[PDB]
PDB file of all heavy atoms in Angstrom:
ATOM      1  N   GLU A 242      -7.315   9.342   8.505  1.00  0.00           N
ATOM      2  CA  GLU A 242      -5.911   9.332   8.883  1.00  0.00           C
ATOM      3  C   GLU A 242      -5.608   8.257   9.934  1.00  0.00           C
ATOM      4  O   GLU A 242      -4.694   7.456   9.767  1.00  0.00           O
ATOM      5  CB  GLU A 242      -5.531  10.719   9.403  1.00  0.00           C
ATOM      6  CG  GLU A 242      -4.135  10.840   9.971  1.00  0.00           C
ATOM      7  CD  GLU A 242      -3.772  12.284  10.271  1.00  0.00           C
ATOM      8  OE1 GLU A 242      -3.445  13.026   9.321  1.00  0.00           O
ATOM      9  OE2 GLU A 242      -3.830  12.685  11.456  1.00  0.00           O
ATOM     10  N   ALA A 243      -6.377   8.239  11.018  1.00  0.00           N
ATOM     11  CA  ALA A 243      -6.170   7.251  12.072  1.00  0.00           C
ATOM     12  C   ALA A 243      -6.409   5.847  11.521  1.00  0.00           C
ATOM     13  O   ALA A 243      -5.671   4.912  11.833  1.00  0.00           O
ATOM     14  CB  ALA A 243      -7.112   7.522  13.237  1.00  0.00           C
ATOM     15  N   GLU A 244      -7.445   5.707  10.703  1.00  0.00           N
ATOM     16  CA  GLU A 244      -7.773   4.418  10.099  1.00  0.00           C
ATOM     17  C   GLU A 244      -6.655   3.921   9.187  1.00  0.00           C
ATOM     18  O   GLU A 244      -6.383   2.725   9.129  1.00  0.00           O
ATOM     19  CB  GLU A 244      -9.072   4.526   9.302  1.00  0.00           C
ATOM     20  CG  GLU A 244     -10.313   4.638  10.166  1.00  0.00           C
ATOM     21  CD  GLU A 244     -10.541   3.395  11.016  1.00  0.00           C
ATOM     22  OE1 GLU A 244     -10.760   2.304  10.441  1.00  0.00           O
ATOM     23  OE2 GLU A 244     -10.500   3.508  12.261  1.00  0.00           O
ATOM     24  N   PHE A 245      -6.013   4.833   8.464  1.00  0.00           N
ATOM     25  CA  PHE A 245      -4.925   4.432   7.586  1.00  0.00           C
ATOM     26  C   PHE A 245      -3.787   3.858   8.426  1.00  0.00           C
ATOM     27  O   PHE A 245      -3.238   2.800   8.105  1.00  0.00           O
ATOM     28  CB  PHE A 245      -4.394   5.622   6.787  1.00  0.00           C
ATOM     29  CG  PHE A 245      -3.288   5.258   5.833  1.00  0.00           C
ATOM     30  CD1 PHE A 245      -3.577   4.777   4.556  1.00  0.00           C
ATOM     31  CD2 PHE A 245      -1.960   5.370   6.219  1.00  0.00           C
ATOM     32  CE1 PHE A 245      -2.551   4.414   3.678  1.00  0.00           C
ATOM     33  CE2 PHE A 245      -0.931   5.009   5.354  1.00  0.00           C
ATOM     34  CZ  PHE A 245      -1.228   4.530   4.080  1.00  0.00           C
ATOM     35  N   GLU A 246      -3.435   4.562   9.499  1.00  0.00           N
ATOM     36  CA  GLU A 246      -2.356   4.113  10.371  1.00  0.00           C
ATOM     37  C   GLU A 246      -2.631   2.731  10.930  1.00  0.00           C
ATOM     38  O   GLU A 246      -1.732   1.902  11.036  1.00  0.00           O
ATOM     39  CB  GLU A 246      -2.152   5.097  11.523  1.00  0.00           C
ATOM     40  CG  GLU A 246      -1.378   6.341  11.120  1.00  0.00           C
ATOM     41  CD  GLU A 246      -0.083   6.004  10.387  1.00  0.00           C
ATOM     42  OE1 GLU A 246       0.753   5.256  10.948  1.00  0.00           O
ATOM     43  OE2 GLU A 246       0.095   6.484   9.245  1.00  0.00           O
ATOM     44  N   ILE A 247      -3.882   2.482  11.282  1.00  0.00           N
ATOM     45  CA  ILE A 247      -4.257   1.192  11.824  1.00  0.00           C
ATOM     46  C   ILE A 247      -4.004   0.107  10.786  1.00  0.00           C
ATOM     47  O   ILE A 247      -3.435  -0.946  11.093  1.00  0.00           O
ATOM     48  CB  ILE A 247      -5.740   1.187  12.251  1.00  0.00           C
ATOM     49  CG1 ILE A 247      -5.923   2.094  13.477  1.00  0.00           C
ATOM     50  CG2 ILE A 247      -6.194  -0.239  12.550  1.00  0.00           C
ATOM     51  CD1 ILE A 247      -7.354   2.181  13.995  1.00  0.00           C
ATOM     52  N   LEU A 248      -4.410   0.373   9.551  1.00  0.00           N
ATOM     53  CA  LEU A 248      -4.217  -0.589   8.468  1.00  0.00           C
ATOM     54  C   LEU A 248      -2.743  -0.823   8.193  1.00  0.00           C
ATOM     55  O   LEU A 248      -2.302  -1.961   8.046  1.00  0.00           O
ATOM     56  CB  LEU A 248      -4.883  -0.093   7.184  1.00  0.00           C
ATOM     57  CG  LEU A 248      -6.404  -0.052   7.171  1.00  0.00           C
ATOM     58  CD1 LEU A 248      -6.888   0.519   5.838  1.00  0.00           C
ATOM     59  CD2 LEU A 248      -6.945  -1.458   7.380  1.00  0.00           C
ATOM     60  N   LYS A 249      -1.988   0.270   8.116  1.00  0.00           N
ATOM     61  CA  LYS A 249      -0.559   0.205   7.839  1.00  0.00           C
ATOM     62  C   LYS A 249       0.167  -0.705   8.826  1.00  0.00           C
ATOM     63  O   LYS A 249       1.157  -1.350   8.481  1.00  0.00           O
ATOM     64  CB  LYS A 249       0.031   1.619   7.877  1.00  0.00           C
ATOM     65  CG  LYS A 249       1.464   1.727   7.395  1.00  0.00           C
ATOM     66  CD  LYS A 249       1.925   3.176   7.419  1.00  0.00           C
ATOM     67  CE  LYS A 249       3.346   3.317   6.916  1.00  0.00           C
ATOM     68  NZ  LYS A 249       3.466   2.883   5.500  1.00  0.00           N
ATOM     69  N   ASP A 250      -0.338  -0.763  10.053  1.00  0.00           N
ATOM     70  CA  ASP A 250       0.264  -1.600  11.081  1.00  0.00           C
ATOM     71  C   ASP A 250      -0.162  -3.069  10.989  1.00  0.00           C
ATOM     72  O   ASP A 250       0.584  -3.960  11.386  1.00  0.00           O
ATOM     73  CB  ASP A 250      -0.090  -1.062  12.470  1.00  0.00           C
ATOM     74  CG  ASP A 250       0.200  -2.064  13.573  1.00  0.00           C
ATOM     75  OD1 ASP A 250       1.378  -2.438  13.748  1.00  0.00           O
ATOM     76  OD2 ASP A 250      -0.751  -2.488  14.266  1.00  0.00           O
ATOM     77  N   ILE A 251      -1.354  -3.319  10.459  1.00  0.00           N
ATOM     78  CA  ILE A 251      -1.880  -4.677  10.349  1.00  0.00           C
ATOM     79  C   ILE A 251      -1.493  -5.433   9.083  1.00  0.00           C
ATOM     80  O   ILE A 251      -1.196  -6.628   9.126  1.00  0.00           O
ATOM     81  CB  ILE A 251      -3.420  -4.665  10.434  1.00  0.00           C
ATOM     82  CG1 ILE A 251      -3.861  -4.069  11.773  1.00  0.00           C
ATOM     83  CG2 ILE A 251      -3.966  -6.075  10.273  1.00  0.00           C
ATOM     84  CD1 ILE A 251      -5.346  -3.776  11.848  1.00  0.00           C
ATOM     85  N   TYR A 252      -1.499  -4.730   7.960  1.00  0.00           N
ATOM     86  CA  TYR A 252      -1.198  -5.334   6.670  1.00  0.00           C
ATOM     87  C   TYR A 252       0.084  -4.833   6.028  1.00  0.00           C
ATOM     88  O   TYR A 252       0.721  -3.892   6.510  1.00  0.00           O
ATOM     89  CB  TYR A 252      -2.338  -5.033   5.695  1.00  0.00           C
ATOM     90  CG  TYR A 252      -3.690  -5.517   6.142  1.00  0.00           C
ATOM     91  CD1 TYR A 252      -4.612  -4.643   6.712  1.00  0.00           C
ATOM     92  CD2 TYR A 252      -4.049  -6.855   5.998  1.00  0.00           C
ATOM     93  CE1 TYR A 252      -5.863  -5.093   7.126  1.00  0.00           C
ATOM     94  CE2 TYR A 252      -5.295  -7.312   6.404  1.00  0.00           C
ATOM     95  CZ  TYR A 252      -6.197  -6.428   6.965  1.00  0.00           C
ATOM     96  OH  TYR A 252      -7.431  -6.887   7.350  1.00  0.00           O
ATOM     97  N   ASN A 253       0.453  -5.486   4.929  1.00  0.00           N
ATOM     98  CA  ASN A 253       1.596  -5.064   4.130  1.00  0.00           C
ATOM     99  C   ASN A 253       0.918  -4.215   3.055  1.00  0.00           C
ATOM    100  O   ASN A 253       0.096  -4.719   2.286  1.00  0.00           O
ATOM    101  CB  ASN A 253       2.304  -6.244   3.449  1.00  0.00           C
ATOM    102  CG  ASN A 253       3.222  -7.003   4.386  1.00  0.00           C
ATOM    103  OD1 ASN A 253       3.780  -6.436   5.330  1.00  0.00           O
ATOM    104  ND2 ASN A 253       3.404  -8.292   4.114  1.00  0.00           N
ATOM    105  N   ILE A 254       1.232  -2.927   3.015  1.00  0.00           N
ATOM    106  CA  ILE A 254       0.628  -2.051   2.018  1.00  0.00           C
ATOM    107  C   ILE A 254       1.647  -1.835   0.909  1.00  0.00           C
ATOM    108  O   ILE A 254       2.708  -1.252   1.131  1.00  0.00           O
ATOM    109  CB  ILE A 254       0.216  -0.703   2.647  1.00  0.00           C
ATOM    110  CG1 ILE A 254      -0.783  -0.960   3.782  1.00  0.00           C
ATOM    111  CG2 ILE A 254      -0.411   0.195   1.603  1.00  0.00           C
ATOM    112  CD1 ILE A 254      -1.299   0.294   4.469  1.00  0.00           C
ATOM    113  N   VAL A 255       1.326  -2.333  -0.282  1.00  0.00           N
ATOM    114  CA  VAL A 255       2.219  -2.221  -1.429  1.00  0.00           C
ATOM    115  C   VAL A 255       1.888  -0.984  -2.262  1.00  0.00           C
ATOM    116  O   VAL A 255       0.746  -0.789  -2.677  1.00  0.00           O
ATOM    117  CB  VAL A 255       2.122  -3.477  -2.325  1.00  0.00           C
ATOM    118  CG1 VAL A 255       3.184  -3.425  -3.427  1.00  0.00           C
ATOM    119  CG2 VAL A 255       2.278  -4.728  -1.476  1.00  0.00           C
ATOM    120  N   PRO A 256       2.894  -0.131  -2.513  1.00  0.00           N
ATOM    121  CA  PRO A 256       2.722   1.099  -3.297  1.00  0.00           C
ATOM    122  C   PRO A 256       2.459   0.747  -4.752  1.00  0.00           C
ATOM    123  O   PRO A 256       2.629  -0.407  -5.159  1.00  0.00           O
ATOM    124  CB  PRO A 256       4.074   1.810  -3.149  1.00  0.00           C
ATOM    125  CG  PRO A 256       4.757   1.105  -1.984  1.00  0.00           C
ATOM    126  CD  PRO A 256       4.306  -0.310  -2.129  1.00  0.00           C
ATOM    127  N   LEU A 257       2.050   1.737  -5.538  1.00  0.00           N
ATOM    128  CA  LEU A 257       1.830   1.496  -6.954  1.00  0.00           C
ATOM    129  C   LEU A 257       3.221   1.705  -7.560  1.00  0.00           C
ATOM    130  O   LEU A 257       3.505   2.748  -8.157  1.00  0.00           O
ATOM    131  CB  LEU A 257       0.827   2.499  -7.531  1.00  0.00           C
ATOM    132  CG  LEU A 257       0.074   2.069  -8.805  1.00  0.00           C
ATOM    133  CD1 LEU A 257      -1.017   3.081  -9.128  1.00  0.00           C
ATOM    134  CD2 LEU A 257       1.041   1.931  -9.970  1.00  0.00           C
ATOM    135  N   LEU A 258       4.090   0.716  -7.350  1.00  0.00           N
ATOM    136  CA  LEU A 258       5.469   0.732  -7.837  1.00  0.00           C
ATOM    137  C   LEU A 258       5.570   0.895  -9.353  1.00  0.00           C
ATOM    138  O   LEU A 258       4.629   0.594 -10.093  1.00  0.00           O
ATOM    139  CB  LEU A 258       6.183  -0.561  -7.438  1.00  0.00           C
ATOM    140  CG  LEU A 258       6.269  -0.941  -5.956  1.00  0.00           C
ATOM    141  CD1 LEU A 258       6.881  -2.333  -5.835  1.00  0.00           C
ATOM    142  CD2 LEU A 258       7.089   0.084  -5.190  1.00  0.00           C
ATOM    143  N   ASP A 259       6.732   1.356  -9.804  1.00  0.00           N
ATOM    144  CA  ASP A 259       6.964   1.567 -11.221  1.00  0.00           C
ATOM    145  C   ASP A 259       6.735   0.293 -12.022  1.00  0.00           C
ATOM    146  O   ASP A 259       6.133   0.331 -13.095  1.00  0.00           O
ATOM    147  CB  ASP A 259       8.383   2.085 -11.458  1.00  0.00           C
ATOM    148  CG  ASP A 259       8.661   3.376 -10.708  1.00  0.00           C
ATOM    149  OD1 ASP A 259       7.745   4.229 -10.631  1.00  0.00           O
ATOM    150  OD2 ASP A 259       9.795   3.543 -10.204  1.00  0.00           O
ATOM    151  N   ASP A 260       7.203  -0.839 -11.502  1.00  0.00           N
ATOM    152  CA  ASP A 260       7.025  -2.107 -12.202  1.00  0.00           C
ATOM    153  C   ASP A 260       5.546  -2.480 -12.289  1.00  0.00           C
ATOM    154  O   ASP A 260       5.111  -3.095 -13.266  1.00  0.00           O
ATOM    155  CB  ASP A 260       7.832  -3.209 -11.508  1.00  0.00           C
ATOM    156  CG  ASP A 260       9.329  -2.935 -11.544  1.00  0.00           C
ATOM    157  OD1 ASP A 260       9.834  -2.564 -12.625  1.00  0.00           O
ATOM    158  OD2 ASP A 260      10.002  -3.090 -10.500  1.00  0.00           O
ATOM    159  N   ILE A 261       4.776  -2.103 -11.269  1.00  0.00           N
ATOM    160  CA  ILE A 261       3.342  -2.373 -11.258  1.00  0.00           C
ATOM    161  C   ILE A 261       2.678  -1.442 -12.288  1.00  0.00           C
ATOM    162  O   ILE A 261       1.769  -1.845 -13.000  1.00  0.00           O
ATOM    163  CB  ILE A 261       2.735  -2.127  -9.851  1.00  0.00           C
ATOM    164  CG1 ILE A 261       3.220  -3.207  -8.876  1.00  0.00           C
ATOM    165  CG2 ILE A 261       1.211  -2.147  -9.920  1.00  0.00           C
ATOM    166  CD1 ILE A 261       2.870  -2.924  -7.414  1.00  0.00           C
ATOM    167  N   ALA A 262       3.149  -0.200 -12.365  1.00  0.00           N
ATOM    168  CA  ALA A 262       2.614   0.768 -13.316  1.00  0.00           C
ATOM    169  C   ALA A 262       2.845   0.250 -14.737  1.00  0.00           C
ATOM    170  O   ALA A 262       1.931   0.220 -15.561  1.00  0.00           O
ATOM    171  CB  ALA A 262       3.301   2.126 -13.132  1.00  0.00           C
ATOM    172  N   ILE A 263       4.076  -0.170 -15.002  1.00  0.00           N
ATOM    173  CA  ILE A 263       4.457  -0.693 -16.300  1.00  0.00           C
ATOM    174  C   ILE A 263       3.625  -1.910 -16.693  1.00  0.00           C
ATOM    175  O   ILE A 263       3.041  -1.946 -17.775  1.00  0.00           O
ATOM    176  CB  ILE A 263       5.945  -1.097 -16.309  1.00  0.00           C
ATOM    177  CG1 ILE A 263       6.829   0.148 -16.169  1.00  0.00           C
ATOM    178  CG2 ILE A 263       6.270  -1.852 -17.587  1.00  0.00           C
ATOM    179  CD1 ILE A 263       8.290  -0.169 -15.858  1.00  0.00           C
ATOM    180  N   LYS A 264       3.582  -2.912 -15.817  1.00  0.00           N
ATOM    181  CA  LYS A 264       2.830  -4.132 -16.100  1.00  0.00           C
ATOM    182  C   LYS A 264       1.329  -3.874 -16.209  1.00  0.00           C
ATOM    183  O   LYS A 264       0.644  -4.497 -17.020  1.00  0.00           O
ATOM    184  CB  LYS A 264       3.101  -5.187 -15.022  1.00  0.00           C
ATOM    185  CG  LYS A 264       2.407  -6.516 -15.283  1.00  0.00           C
ATOM    186  CD  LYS A 264       2.700  -7.536 -14.183  1.00  0.00           C
ATOM    187  CE  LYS A 264       4.150  -8.024 -14.213  1.00  0.00           C
ATOM    188  NZ  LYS A 264       4.461  -8.804 -15.441  1.00  0.00           N
ATOM    189  N   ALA A 265       0.816  -2.961 -15.392  1.00  0.00           N
ATOM    190  CA  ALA A 265      -0.607  -2.643 -15.434  1.00  0.00           C
ATOM    191  C   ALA A 265      -0.957  -2.060 -16.800  1.00  0.00           C
ATOM    192  O   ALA A 265      -2.041  -2.306 -17.335  1.00  0.00           O
ATOM    193  CB  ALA A 265      -0.962  -1.651 -14.337  1.00  0.00           C
ATOM    194  N   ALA A 266      -0.029  -1.294 -17.366  1.00  0.00           N
ATOM    195  CA  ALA A 266      -0.240  -0.680 -18.671  1.00  0.00           C
ATOM    196  C   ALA A 266      -0.302  -1.742 -19.777  1.00  0.00           C
ATOM    197  O   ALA A 266      -1.179  -1.698 -20.648  1.00  0.00           O
ATOM    198  CB  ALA A 266       0.874   0.320 -18.957  1.00  0.00           C
TER     199      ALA A 266
END
């Protein structure tokens, strides 16, 4: 949990967006 927060503050974390889901398929 703490490690995730640290990352979230340092990088741009991109969700598995619908468009990514579609294209990945």
Side-chain angles (χ1 to χ4, degrees):
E242 174 172 282
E244 287 296 297
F245 182 85
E246 282 310 304
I247 291 180
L248 291 178
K249 189 178 181 62
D250 166 62
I251 300 169
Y252 302 100
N253 281 330
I254 301 181
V255 187
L257 203 172
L258 302 174
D259 302 322
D260 297 314
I261 290 170
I263 293 167
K264 183 180 290 294

